[PDB]
């Protein structure tokens, strides 16, 4: 499973504790494929893996903010391509995700602000932009 | 889904 110390968790995510939420997801979905795969592969994931990934999310954020804050619409060629990046790297770190699959993840993204507050810590008013950018992206990439 | 809190989830 996840190999991190309360003090180390923060070094990689910063406040996000999987153990506490581990129990919570168990009750919420306690049987979804996306979740089972996380447990499946994560058991093999080390710190080096999560950090390379977090740095990945950060980078992904850096472009979203530079492009998003630019007042660029979420269905922008610039925004749509962002989502492409979002799907590629995210699926390979937790589970093979489809357009229909996580596009919806994108809409429920706002429902549990636990996600939004940790993500938006980098920019106020982004969790929602990701949702429109990601959801829209699935529209054109879903034939 | 997945973690409640970093980026994947549960619900489609
Ligand atoms: C970082 C992490 C730890 C435990 C479980 C997880 N599921 C997901 C879904 O995105 C992620 C990235 C994590």
3-state secondary structure of A65: helix
Q: Tell me if chain B has a CB within 8 Å of the CB of A10.
A: no
Q: What single DSSP character describes residue A106?
A: H
Technique employed here was NMR
A136 within 8 A of A75, measured Cβ to Cβ = yes
Q: Fill in the DSSP letter of residue A29.
A: T
Identify whether the C-beta of residue A79 lies closer than 8 Å to the C-beta of residue A131.
no
Name every residue whose Cβ is closer than 8 Å to that of residue B2 and which is 6 or more positions away in sequence. A25, A32, A34, A35, A38, A94, B8, B9, B10
User: What does each C-alpha distance from A91 to A13, A53, A76, A96, B7 come to in angstroms?
Assistant: 19, 11, 23, 5, 11
Number of structural domains (chain A) is 1
A30: left (phi > 0), else alpha (psi -120 to 50), else beta? Answer: left
Nearest to A115 by CA among A91, B9, A102: B9
Range of the domain at A40: 1-143
The secondary structure element, H or E, covering residue A66 is helix A47-68
Q: Which residue of A has its CA nearest to B9?
A: A105
CB atoms within 10 A of CB A80: 19
**What's the gap in Å between the CA of B3 and the closest CA on chain A?**
6
Nearest CA in chain A to B11: A105
User: What's the token pair of residue A116?
Assistant: 């939004």
């Amino acid at each position: 499973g996840i190999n991190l110390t309360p003090e180390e968790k923060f070094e990689v995510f910063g406040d996000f504790d999987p153990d506490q939420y581990e129990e919570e997801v168990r009750e919420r979905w306690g049987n979804t494929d996306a979740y089972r795969q996380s447990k499946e592969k994560t058991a093999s994931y080390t710190k080096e893996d999560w950090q390379r990934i977090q740095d990945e999310a950060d980078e992904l954020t850096r472009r979203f903010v530079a492009l998003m804050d630019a007042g660029e619409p979420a269905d922008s060629e610039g925004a749509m391509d962002a989502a492409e990046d979002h799907r590629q790297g995210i699926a390979r770190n937790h589970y093979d995700c489809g357009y229909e699959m996580h596009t919806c993840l994108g809409e429920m993204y706002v429902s549990d602000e636990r996600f939004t507050r940790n993500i938006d810590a980098a920019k106020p008013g982004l969790a929602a932009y990701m949702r429109d950018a990601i959801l829209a992206n699935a529209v054109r990439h879903t034939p | 889904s997945c973690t409640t809190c970093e980026c994947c989830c549960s619900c489609a």
